[PDB]
Design a protein around this ligand. Sequence first.
Ligand SMILES: Nc1[nH]c(=O)[nH]c(=O)c1N
Ligand SMILES: Nc1[nH]c(=O)[nH]c(=O)c1N
Ligand SMILES: Nc1[nH]c(=O)[nH]c(=O)c1N
Ligand SMILES: Nc1[nH]c(=O)[nH]c(=O)c1N
Lengths: 294, 295, 295, 298
Amino acid sequence: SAVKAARYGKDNVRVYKVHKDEKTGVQTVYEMTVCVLLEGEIETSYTKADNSVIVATDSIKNTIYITAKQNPVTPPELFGSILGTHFIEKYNHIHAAHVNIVCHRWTRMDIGKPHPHSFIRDSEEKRNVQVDVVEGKGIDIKSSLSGLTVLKSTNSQFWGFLRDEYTTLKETWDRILSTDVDATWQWKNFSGLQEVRSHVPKFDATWATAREVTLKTFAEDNSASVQATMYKMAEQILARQQLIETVEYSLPNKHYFEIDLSWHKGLQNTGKNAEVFAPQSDPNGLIKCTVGRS
Amino acid sequence: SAVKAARYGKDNVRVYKVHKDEKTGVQTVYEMTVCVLLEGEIETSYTKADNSVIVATDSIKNTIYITAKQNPVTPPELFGSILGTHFIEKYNHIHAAHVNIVCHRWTRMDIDGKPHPHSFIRDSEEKRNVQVDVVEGKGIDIKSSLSGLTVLKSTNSQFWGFLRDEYTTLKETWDRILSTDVDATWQWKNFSGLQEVRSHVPKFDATWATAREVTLKTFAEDNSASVQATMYKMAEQILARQQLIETVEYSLPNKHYFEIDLSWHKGLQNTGKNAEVFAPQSDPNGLIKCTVGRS
Amino acid sequence: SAVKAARYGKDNVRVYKVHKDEKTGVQTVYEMTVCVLLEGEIETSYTKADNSVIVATDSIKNTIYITAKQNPVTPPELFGSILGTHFIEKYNHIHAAHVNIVCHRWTRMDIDGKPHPHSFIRDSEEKRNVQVDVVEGKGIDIKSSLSGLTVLKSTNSQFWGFLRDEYTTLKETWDRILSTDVDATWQWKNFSGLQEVRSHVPKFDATWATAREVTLKTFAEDNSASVQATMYKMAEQILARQQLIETVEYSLPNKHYFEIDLSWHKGLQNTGKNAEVFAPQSDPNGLIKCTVGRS
Amino acid sequence: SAVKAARYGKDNVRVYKVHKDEKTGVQTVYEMTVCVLLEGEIETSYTKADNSVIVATDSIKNTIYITAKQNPVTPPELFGSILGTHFIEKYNHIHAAHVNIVCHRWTRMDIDGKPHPHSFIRDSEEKRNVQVDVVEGKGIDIKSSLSGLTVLKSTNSQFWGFLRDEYTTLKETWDRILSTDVDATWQWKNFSGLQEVRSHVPKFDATWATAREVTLKTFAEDNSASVQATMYKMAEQILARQQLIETVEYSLPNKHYFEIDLSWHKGLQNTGKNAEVFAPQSDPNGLIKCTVGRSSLK
Ligand SMILES: Nc1[nH]c(=O)[nH]c(=O)c1N
Ligand SMILES: Nc1[nH]c(=O)[nH]c(=O)c1N
Ligand SMILES: Nc1[nH]c(=O)[nH]c(=O)c1N
Ligand SMILES: Nc1[nH]c(=O)[nH]c(=O)c1N
């Protein structure tokens, strides 16, 4: 037998960093969870028990802290870039670095005044980046939002789908639509650290756009197909930023079922009279697509 | 042997109710998870396998749905009271209903600065709960709370002056991160029946609001050297601002962030005045509780 | 306002300890998560920012490690008693320690049916736990328990003859699935202090063993139409077997499996007698409780 | 724009089946969570809102129950294959089904040393999984695996002779605790259709059993200096005992147990050789992965 693939690294490294502005007094905090896996001339640690080729997982840990110490940590795309580039450069036998970064929200609180040093976790929503640094191939970056959960109580439908002897579902012209939204936009390959730094302002700006399109489309679109809603979201993101190659959406649906109460004193709670529903934990629809340029 | 205590019922009954406005076309959503437990003359179901005194747990579920259909689901203090009352009035063997409610956030989305008539975002894992205890001839006990509210402040928190002995290694410190989850409970004065409850309805949302605000505002502003110290200030003001509350309870996990000493690597400065990069700890955590009532 | 109640301490302290038999070669491990909350004359920390009455939570943490180093960690009833006793003995102003311990399974691996000297598998999420209360001048209260035990039986369960009103829709049934997680608590007669506890050491493991075995066996054998009656049987036998227990407490969150009607499809038969494929429901679920003591 | 990829379907379908043998009266339970995703000529639901090409996700759910009703659910490699094959046959516009199946453990209880005919216990959170890709005329790819297997050995594990530089603080060590979750994936050689899959049915359970047991035994016996070295021994053995496996994949998170220096307190003795009490860490953790295949040498 033979190694067809190997990577190893450190997962779940929690990192906090603060930025104290001494002029205005204002503090700013950043919290993230970091995952780094390395590939390279390491066959022999598997085949031959040879550890000399292994940069220890504990040292990878140190490097993360050291790197955050000395470099910006925002936007995550730049940090993940610096961090990965370091590994392919400090070590001759390491030729690929995969860096994963989960950004946790710490929004500054309003006491109508922004407070200079106090934050609240105002949502379990995350902002993430996967950055792959391969020797001679530059830097690929997938950027994403996830954990964004929404509901609209009307202006969705579902009718006209395939009907056979497996179908029981009734068609509907007014229904609840709810979903978690996970959205990944993929950047054009960058050639190295360099080209990445010249693009820094685009990253935050693109996140904000991606979030805002998602929110506003989901809210204003009145469709009978979640598919079509997702596609319109992707289009505008593509339209709005030249450097993005692909947009990818994954929406896990949350069903809310009607509850027939007519067995009880003829209470009317279906159709136009539906007021009380039963949120279902499972099962759940799951819809994806990846959308690119023509 | 003999049965000292017995309770049974339905847990985790997910409920959603929509409100549609007529004129305006604005919709409002409410979603909760409801738990209802019954007490009463039910011993023989344990001792003699007698099911004739069991209201089926499936029926408790239908009851929840139906009560929610014919009644306001908000404030949940009301709704709990209506639902616990129904039990003791419909059944002579049932003498106590215990109703737990967890309300989940569905905030209305802001779209280009306008508020959207029918879309919402789950904008925090934070919850608003009530526990309502309806006991035959003791009226209605209500515990209101907020939990899951997670905060950090990067400075203006200290910790010195604690006892030291041959178990201590903590250094003292005049600047540290302070992050916690906030669990806060306010107990209302006993109420006599649904009647009295109906009549204090607007005090309910108002006091939740007040509670959130005092917690938030006190946590930002207090430059304190004691989590105990800050909590107590929070409780005091809530007692001060609402006559009908008898006790305030705070439970605060105190989630630690460690300084990472980076000096062994090219003498790098990351502690004291210089600390910029820290390791949040998943565990262990400090836990500080108290109940504060009037004198 | 006054402080009605207050405690503080260290939650989620994970602790591992290994025992090496330098004779046999045989190693044995223990891993638990520990929580220690102190009570005492500590008002002033809350009222007047005074920390000189605060034994830092950090030092509570150090103390767990230190005690675990010098004492047996098994049975956890012992160690919790030793641990809470240290606190009220060494601090004048501390009058109560509450110690909680969750023990995680590391069962010895069988490699070619030989027990292995040093490898273990987490063979279940089931926990063994203690709650230990050490109050000054009141001695030691210990609640021992098992939780996270999940079982299922595919037949020999019925449910019929419960109460039927205009809230009821549930069909009565003579063969159904019964599944539940089992949370079971046995409460020891008050001990007077560390000595009394020690002289009872071997009763602890033995009792946990019996509670488990009684639980499984009664659940498997009992062909009942009432979950209540099954729980009660379990509790009698636990009391009959161990004099020193005062009460036994059972919390049964039970999980539903619904029939799936498939007759709309080619008249396929999947209900009552013909039921084979079922849909397990994540929620809601029934929840049944009791405390049984001696009359 | 253009749809470059699209899949839609039903995730988290919980399913239980009971098999009653009325000879003996023994009953056997299966429970699993099922995910089915469809691909094929469905672009237009996205670009033009056309629902006429969508099999409604509620219908995918019905189909899972009905198939479980009319077929065996075990081994999950067969069930998945049946289940996926059905979607490519019933619909022309569907060209691929991806089926994911998590199986949950219900082990028979022993009461007084005898198996009970009809009670079971969730004896572990360990799962047995299949991923089954059923694509038009490329037949049936099947990744099988186990996950949720948590193990610890408290000595006979070492770590020394690793690269040292100005990022390193780790002490070399010759006795330490090794714990991990084991996640392990065997990839089967492509099968040409259902037919081929039924005629390998007995090999499914046996390979899961071997895979598990090889994992257990190697983990316990190896005195390694390398988690890598140890994962590689496991994969080699699996590959040697089943021909129809092409690749083995291992993914091992290592959970750390730190030493606690207690020497500042009454000179207390708790590191290297007298270490008895440790601080298990929730995070961070090492993650070692590898795919192991067959050699091309002779
Ligand atoms: N700590 C540790 N242990 C291993 O077996 N392998 C590794 O790579 C590291 N870093
Ligand atoms: N299914 C079930 N089982 C019980 O033991 N008690 C109950 O009330 C119900 N509804
Ligand atoms: N470490 C710490 N921090 C607090 O705010 N309060 C406390 O009581 C302790 N022990
Ligand atoms: N049942 C359902 N609901 C949707 O919104 N979209 C879909 O595609 C299906 N199949």
